Symmetry: C2
Subunit: 86 residues, 2 copies
């Protein structure tokens, strides 16, 4: 059974990074799963539906990198995108 | 859709789940911003040999306690994952 003692910091720090990153209209959803002592993270951000895919791709990837570099106990981070018209 | 309550919702709900009576640990937690609301899916590890009516009461006490205590939450779902340490 996974320990879980880091879930709260992981979710908070990752959400805070995602929410204020460039081109994000808001966070759509965030999911954390305890595995061993660490957390697997799935975050999904709202972006402009007219963004080019190569642009949404850079945005998602900057967020992923920044979460990986800054947030302890994160094992695996996926950042997905939901298009919205603005 | 603002998302400013996600952090408190996830932290408070996680804490309630994790310190409830028959939970070995939290398996996963998911929050989704809907309008001003957060929709919450939380999944707890319980003893595989618990009776189903018991795990049902446990999940339901956690759901109620989250609904009663955590602001900005709608449609809380509490799911169960059995684990046999045996």
């Amino acid at each position: 059974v996974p320990r879980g003692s880091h879930m709260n910091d992981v979710l908070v720090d990752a959400y805070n990074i995602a929410k204020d990153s460039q081109h994000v209209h808001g966070v759509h959803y965030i999911r954390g799963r305890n595995v061993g002592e660490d957390v697997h993270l799935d975050i999904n951000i709202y972006v402009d539906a007219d963004l080019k895919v190569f642009e949404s791709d850079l945005v998602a990837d900057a967020i992923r990198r920044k979460i990986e570099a800054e947030v302890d106990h994160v094992r695996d981070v996926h950042v997905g995108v939901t298009p919205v018209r603005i």
